Design a protein around this ligand. Structure first.
Ligand SMILES: [Mg+2]
Ligand SMILES: [Zn+2]
Ligand SMILES: [Zn+2]
Lengths: 48, 1336, 79, 49
DNA sequence: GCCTTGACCCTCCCCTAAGGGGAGGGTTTAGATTGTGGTCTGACGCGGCG
DNA sequence: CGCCGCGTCAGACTGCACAAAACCCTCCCCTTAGGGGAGGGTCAAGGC
RNA sequence: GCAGU
């Protein structure tokens, strides 16, 4: 509803196509946050 | 996708690996054509194309060739969205210190180099040199030098040694240092150091160095040689429509950095003098430090509005930073908002939703149902149809909202009932219609309140709105288990008016065939709603097997209670309506129905109660006129009597008999007595003015006055307001709190004159300003509690523990404040509760104490039940469902997955706006019993307590205590131990103003070193008849008897030294200074009489209790159990020593003797007994008396604040916060483990490490638990995302970076930040799957 | 329709597991060829899901064995 | 404002918690009908295209 | 008695090269100029001096 | 130990109205001609 | 800034 840019368009097309299902990704504010912490001299990451 | 977030320092290689090119020029864009300029801050070649699949020369324009690096301009042909992801970099011409690792205290560069921050700031501001390598020279490695000292060293030593200045020097020092060698050297000189301060400095430095060697970090990465450049779509330069541009402050700061950097490269090429290049390096350092954190070092840079530029650190921290403003809460689609109105026709699960709000909130649903049903051929056709609002889209809209809940929310959402789901009923207004019964949950009145509506989109969201949050599931409160969907002012007044009785009412005395005939008579106007009547009532009771058995009986009733019986569900008794139903009686009706019958009958009963209360309040015509406020006709003469009395106290002041202080106090008390007289006369006139005729005889009944009917219902108001309407409104305070000596002798029915009205505004505006300024304090307390407790989820069914707190009723002095019932209701027992007659278990060991079991506990007289608590739960990383107890909102044992910490924090901080800003006489019959006793008999027949903490309870004939008093040391007790008393009589008396020392055993005087003139000053006075003596002060003694303390001891006339029975150590009385003795040498005093005398709340209180802050002058508690003695003196601190004979005796304390000490040198003490008196510090309670002791202390001291304002909160919620407070431990013995002595570890970590060590035979570490405040415990979590998100983002992020930390997203905030399912609730199964399939 | 879900929570011994099972069954009925086991009285698939839960016709075990059955039958077409 | 004839009585819950019940003769007689004037600006600018 | 596949010729449109001109970056000036400009918060924890 | 200096904190939602100059030299953009290509117009053969 | 809850 706020931030998943690829996810909110999919949500709209799923509500329209009769399928009340979400495919949530990472909120874009968190990517803004990881890019703003990395613009300080700090290496923040996502591990797997 | 990913399971953890690792933070670390960024190597210059890492900074050059992120970047897609170097920003060489400060150009943002071209001014004529707004295309971005090459090698600039906005560079399409570096940061990606400015349009989708189009290079900036336009030579390549379609995704036929995507991913193509154009040759005419170097722009890739790809999406423009990559400008939000692609970073750049700046090659700094000089190494520049990172401001976060230089200035956020403690300085990491300073802590690492063992160098003060003033020295480092002088080296890197080019004010001093530093010797980066000594060589064969007397110059050491951290030796700073001035300019001329460096010149002298160059004279004496030449080019052998190496010394530098600036951040190049600091970088050479961080680079040249060896970390493992210096770490082991510091461990050596920590093993050989006993100075505790140096040991603290050494252990923090050692943890820093070992945190560097365990992570991949290198120290010199704290000095920036490459600087990252944020992607240009995150610091955008966007054209406003008016032709002007709008930029972020980051472009100004980056442009400053690049200008100073290119100028530094210029100066280094021109071979400028050292003054200019030093000044330029300083300017580049301060420009980079203003880019990273503006204002952290000195003056903030302000550009072109004379407002400080927002730096990179300001983007991510604070109430306006990313973490709190965009990541924990965010603007949300599918959300509307409007004013709320009543809609009393609704059912409990329904809201009224405007058609024009629901047509916008559900737009894609309507588009899809128009496409599906064939009514629109396209989504463009459906959009046009919804836009024109045809008649068919309203049928579609009725279809799409049918079983689709919406969430209604009234901000501030103080607790979880501030968001509830409802099924929408389409109304034609523009205002939401909020059901009346839920208003008290929202704290919503219809005087302009707005509420937001949110649409749950997915099937999971709809099913949670329907199953978890729907208002029919929410009829109990989660703070206390009481109903919160509860009738209110109009409803309560209707049900009260219906259920009352009048004496000679119309239709009195007839006999009815049931409730239906009563309704027939009332509607036919053949009988009034209050006519006392005889109704045949059939009532059902749930039998022991579980079904409903009937009984039919003629009940003496009124017509209105007969009518109301028609809506009462079946399993309830007739005694539930056969009374005038006030607010509490209706709430008890609903609670009884919920416990007996369940939720589904209770929601029906609640709606029916609301309908019938509204209906019969409408039929009531209940109206407030001006004659309803009857002023008592005794008001004028009571006020004239009080005026005469204050005139006589005024002439007693004019004649000097009384001072103005006692005059003021007596005038205040004889005005408050007159106020209470006026209030009593008013209420006695107002409650019973109905005298009416039964068969001719007049007969008084309860008044049908409307003001009294509203107050007595509990509908609106209390006698505190009726007293201001019809009584007088009494003494008002000044703005400082001192009450004005003349009261408002008027009320609001009469007028207040100009002076009385101004005097009342004094206190009115004080109340308004405190209301407007304490919401910002209660919200901050709630925030701190949420961020300490968020990660506590019920994760188990049982930890199998046997610990638990001993719940007892709260007896403050003479009266009980909370019984055992509301304290143990819902807990599980920790041990077998057994009857006072032993050997038969009343309640078994592990039983949940629901209402039947509590009824069993009050049938018998058990008064202390050991229950299980979350502070004693063996579950690590969570809480078992048995140690919590009941889920107060549902009424059963709590489910696995409940997020109890957020519920506890909301339940504590929701009532925050309701907070602000000598001898004992036994009251009733009982058998007294004293504990902590050391007792003798006096010369006269009293009972004398030679014990400090002896406490006198009143054990009744059943065993339970009904009052508990504190009897001081040496108080004479008129009765024995176990003697019955009379109601209102005195049992113990003592001297309030002085502390007596009492005779241990009968004996004779010995003045041992009681030297006259050196330790004794003789005093004389006439009205005593006998001269007195004083043992001397510290500041009145000559040299002498302060070092040899004067003592008075016991001997016999035999000459034999008679001593304590049982021991042969010399009995003494070491009389301290400021004492009185009127007894001469050799006098005979028996055991039991004195020998000498010695003279002596609100919301901030809750906030201070939870922050665990030490009070001003705390009680000095005895550390270990031993005997008292004394050492050195008069250094400002007398030297106490407590020696146990049965071990290593000496434990010495440094008590400053300006504190009145509360123990003598002869007696034995235990851990926790107050050596001095004062407000206890909770750290001392946790340390000496235990975990359950500080738990009991905190819950009692918090509930004391919450019970003054009449706020019910279950103790589970404070025990959750207490568990989260005592969450760390300190290692005292490292054991066979990987910890260090004196380091603070997570308590669950050390517990499970000890468990896995003991499993392999090796003995584990031993620890001491710590009590942190809610802020210091929120900030000390093992998850840096939660701590950096809470507050002090900069400190948390630097600690986490230099520690090379890792955050596994285990709590709730780290999964809300990254947009995942929370590990609590319906996302708990998902995380169990995720951690059982990402583990194996 | 449903106004209170308490009967379904007594069959599925939790509210969170009830939400998960009812969302799985409602996604079966809504996007999928599966038909309700109760007469659909103009209810949405969430309420039909909860009404099937209430009658004891659907729980997590029944859903799992029905998934196993239809998957084994769909894999039985080896031709 | 306007001198409305009020009665102080609870009416079927429609004046619950500071709500106001209004008769239709207040909407008929145009008592609290208020005129509101809004300016709306259409600014023809010079774009670079 | 009516449909494809070329066939030839015609017409316009987009990329490319060049030329004019506006634009933009650059270099140099020589009477003497010698150190710039709000304070309205209180409580709490901590850390370095003395 | 006392004390001073410094860093961190201070509710949530809503609207409303809003923000030196002069001369040289090369380089890039606008304009125009051209040329290639890429459709568009109107028929000549069997096939349908 | 100014209001509303
Ligand atoms: Mg309100
Ligand atoms: Zn290009
Ligand atoms: Zn437990």
């Amino acid at each position: 509803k706020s931030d998943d840019v690829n996810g909110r368009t999919k949500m709209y097309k799923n509500i329209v196509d009769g399928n009340h299902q979400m495919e949530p990704g990472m909120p874009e504010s968190f990517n803004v946050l990881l890019k703003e912490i990395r613009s300080l001299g700090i290496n923040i990451e996502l591990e797997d | 996708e990913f399971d953890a977030i690792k933070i670390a320092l960024a190597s210059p290689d890492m900074i050059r690996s992120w970047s897609f090119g170097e920003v060489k020029k400060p150009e943002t864009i071209n001014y004529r054509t707004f295309k971005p300029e090459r090698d600039g801050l906005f560079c399409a070649r570096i940061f990606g194309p400015v349009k989708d699949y189009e290079c900036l020369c336009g030579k390549y324009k379609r995704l036929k060739h995507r991913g193509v690096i154009c040759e005419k301009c170097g722009v890739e042909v790809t999406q423009t969205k990559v400008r939000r992801e692609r970073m750049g970099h700046i090659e700094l011409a000089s190494p520049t210190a990172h401001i976060w690792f230089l200035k956020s205290l403690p300085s990491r560069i300073g802590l690492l180099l063992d160098m003060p921050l003033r020295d480092i700031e002088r080296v890197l501001y080019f004010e001093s040199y530093v010797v980066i390598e000594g060589g064969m020279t007397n110059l050491e490695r951290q030796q700073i030098l001035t300019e001329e000292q460096y010149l002298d060293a160059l004279e004496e030593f030449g080019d052998e040694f190496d010394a530098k200045m600036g951040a190049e020097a600091i970088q050479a020092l961080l680079k040249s240092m060896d970390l493992e060698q210096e770490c082991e050297q510091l461990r050596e000189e920590l093993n050989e150091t006993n100075s505790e301060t140096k040991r603290k400095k050494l252990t923090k430095r050692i943890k820093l160095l070992e945190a560097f060697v365990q992570s991949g970090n290198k120290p010199e990465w704290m000095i920036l040689t490459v600087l990252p450049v944020l992607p240009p779509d995150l610091r955008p330069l966007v054209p406003l429509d008016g032709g002007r541009f709008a930029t972020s402050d980051l472009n100004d700061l980056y442009r400053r950095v690049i200008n100073r950097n290119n100028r530094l490269k210029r100066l280094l090429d021109l071979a400028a003098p050292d003054i200019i290049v030093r000044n330029e390096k300083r300017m580049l350092q301060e420009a980079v430090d203003a880019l990273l954190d503006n204002g952290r070092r000195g003056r903030a840079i302000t550009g072109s509005n004379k407002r400080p530029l927002k730096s990179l650190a300001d983007m991510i921290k604070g109430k306006q930073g990313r973490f709190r403003q965009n990541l924990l809460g965010k603007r949300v689609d599918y959300s509307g908002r409007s004013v709320i109105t009543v809609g009393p026709y609704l059912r409990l699960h329904q809201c009224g939703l405007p058609k024009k709000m629901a047509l916008e909130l559900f737009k894609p649903f309507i588009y899809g149902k128009l496409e599906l049903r064939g009514l629109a051929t396209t989504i463009k056709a459906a959009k046009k149809m919804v836009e024109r609002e045809e008649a068919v889209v309203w049928d579609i809209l009725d279809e799409v909202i049918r079983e689709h809940p919406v969430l209604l929310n009234r901000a501030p959402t103080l607790h979880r009932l501030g968001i509830q789901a409802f099924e929408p009923v389409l109304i034609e207004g523009k205002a939401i219609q909020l059901h009346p019964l839920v208003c008290a949950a929202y704290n919503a009145d219809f005087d302009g309140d707005q509420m937001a509506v949110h649409v749950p989109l997915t099937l999971e969201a709809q099913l949670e709105a329907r199953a978890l949050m729907m208002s029919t599931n929410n009829i109990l409160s989660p703070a206390n288990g009481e109903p919160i969907i509860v009738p209110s002012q109009d409803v309560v007044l209707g049900l009260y008016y219906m259920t009352r009785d009048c004496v000679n009412a119309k239709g009195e005395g007839m006999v009815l065939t049931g409730p239906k005939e009563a309704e027939r008579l009332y509607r036919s106007g053949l009988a009034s709603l209050h006519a006392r009547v005889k109704v045949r009532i059939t009532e059902y009771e749930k039998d022991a097997n579980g079904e409903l058995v009937a009984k039919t009986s003629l009940k003496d009733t009124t017509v209105g209670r007969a009518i109301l019986w028609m809506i009462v569900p079946k399993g309830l008794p007739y005694s539930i309506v056969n009374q005038a139903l006030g607010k509490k009686a209706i709430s008890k009706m609903l609670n009884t129905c919920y416990r007996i019958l369940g939720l589904k009958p209770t929601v029906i009963f609640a709606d029916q109660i609301m309908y019938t209360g509204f209906a019969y309040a409408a039929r009531s015509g209940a109206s407030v006129g001006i004659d309803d406020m009857v002023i008592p006709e005794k008001k004028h003469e009571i006020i004239s009597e009080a005026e005469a009395e204050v005139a006589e106290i005024q002439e007693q002041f004019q004649s000097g008999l009384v001072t103005a202080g006692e005059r003021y106090n007596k005038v205040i008390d004889i005005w408050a007595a007159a106020n209470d007289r006026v209030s009593k006369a008013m209420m006695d006139n107002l409650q019973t003015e109905t005298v009416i005729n039964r068969d001719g005889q007049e007969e008084k009944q309860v008044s049908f006055n409307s003001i009294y009917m509203m107050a007595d219902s509990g509908a609106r108001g209390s006698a505190a307001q009726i007293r201001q309407l019809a009584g007088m409104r009494g003494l008002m305070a000044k703005p400082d709190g001192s009450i004005i000596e003349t009261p408002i002798t008027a009320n609001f029915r009469e007028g207040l004159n100009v002076l009385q009205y101004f005097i009342s505004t004094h206190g009115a505006r004080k109340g308004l300003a405190d209301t407007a300024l304490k919401t910002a304090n209660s919200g901050y307390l709630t925030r701190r509690l949420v961020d300490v407790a968020q990660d506590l989820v019920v994760t188990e069914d049982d930890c199998g523990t046997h610990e638990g707190i001993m719940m007892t009723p709260v007896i403050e002095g003479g009266d009980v404040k909370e019984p055992l019932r509301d304290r143990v209701l819902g807990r599980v027992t920790a041990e077998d509760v057994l009857k006072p007659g032993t050997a038969d278990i009343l309640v078994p060991r592990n039983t949940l104490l629901h209402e039947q079991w509590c009824d069993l506990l009050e049938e018998n007289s058990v008064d202390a039940v050991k229950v299980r608590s979350v502070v004693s739960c063996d579950t690590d990383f969570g809480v078992c469902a048995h140690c919590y107890g009941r889920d107060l909102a549902r009424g059963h044992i709590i489910n696995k997955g409940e997020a109890i910490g957020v519920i506890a924090a909301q339940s504590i901080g929701e009532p925050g706006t309701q907070l602000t800003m000598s001898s004992i006489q036994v009251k009733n019959k009982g058998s007294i019993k004293l504990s902590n006793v050391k007792s003798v008999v006096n010369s006269s027949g009293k009972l004398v307590i030679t014990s400090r903490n002896t406490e006198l309870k009143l054990i009744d004939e059943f065993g339970r205590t009904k009052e508990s008093y504190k009897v001081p040391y040496g108080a004479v007790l008129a009765k024995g131990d176990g003697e019955q008393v009379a109601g209102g009589e005195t049992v113990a008396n003592w001297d309030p103003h002085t502390m007596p020392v009492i005779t241990e055993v009968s004996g004779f005087v010995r003045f041992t070193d009681m030297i006259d003139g050196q330790t004794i000053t003789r005093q004389t006075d006439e009205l005593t008849g006998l001269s007195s003596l004083v043992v001397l002060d510290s500041a009145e003694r000559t040299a002498g008897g302060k070092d040899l303390r004067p003592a008075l001891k016991i001997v016999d006339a035999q000459g034999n030294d008679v001593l304590i029975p049982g021991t042969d150590m010399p009995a003494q009385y070491f009389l301290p200074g400021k004492a009185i003795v009127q007894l001469e040498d050799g006098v005979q005093i028996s055991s039991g009489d004195t020998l000498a005398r010695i003279p002596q709340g609100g919301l901030p209180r809750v906030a201070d209790l939870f922050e665990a802050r030490r009070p001003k002058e705390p009680a000095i508690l005895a550390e270990i159990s031993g005997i008292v003695s004394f050492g050195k003196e008069t250094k400002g601190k007398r030297r106490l020593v407590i020696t146990p004979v049965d071990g290593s005796d000496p434990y010495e304390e440094m008590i400053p003797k300006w504190r009145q000490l509360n123990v003598f040198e002869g007696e034995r003490v235990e851990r926790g007994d107050v050596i001095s008196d004062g407000p206890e510090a909770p750290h001392d309670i946790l340390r000496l008396r235990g975990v359950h002791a500080v738990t009991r202390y905190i819950v009692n001291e918090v509930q004391d604040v919450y019970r003054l304002q009449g706020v019910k909160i279950n103790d589970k919620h404070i025990e959750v916060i207490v568990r989260q407070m005592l969450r760390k431990a300190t290692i005292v013995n490292a054991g066979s483990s990987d910890f260090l002595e004196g380091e603070q570890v997570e308590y669950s970590r050390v517990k499970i490490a000890n468990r896995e060590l003991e499993a392999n035979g090796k003995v584990g570490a031993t620890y001491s638990r710590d009590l942190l405040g809610i802020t210091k415990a929120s900030l000390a979590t093992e998850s840096f995302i939660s701590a950096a998100s809470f507050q002090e983002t900069t400190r948390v992020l630097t600690e986490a970076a230099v520690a090379g930390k890792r955050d596994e997203l285990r709590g709730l905030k780290e999964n809300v930040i990254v947009g995942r399912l929370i590990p609590a609730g319906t996302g708990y199964a998902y995380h169990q799957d995720r951690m059982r399939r990402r583990a194996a | 329709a449903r106004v209170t879900v308490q009967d379904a929570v007594e069959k599925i011994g939790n509210r969170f597991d009830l939400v998960l099972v009812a969302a799985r069954r409602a996604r079966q009925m809504q996007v999928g060829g599966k038909d309700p086991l109760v007469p659909e009285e103009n209810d949405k698939t969430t309420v039909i899901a909860l009404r099937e839960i209430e009658e004891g016709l659907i729980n997590n075990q029944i859903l799992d064995v029905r998934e196993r059955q239809e998957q084994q039958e769909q894999e039985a077409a080896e031709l | 404002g306007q001198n409305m004839r009020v009665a102080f009585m609870p009416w079927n819950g429609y004046n619950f918690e500071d709500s106001i019940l209004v008769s239709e003769r207040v909407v008929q007689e145009d008592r609290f009908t208020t005129i509101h004037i809004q300016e709306l600006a259409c600014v023809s600018r010079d774009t670079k295209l």
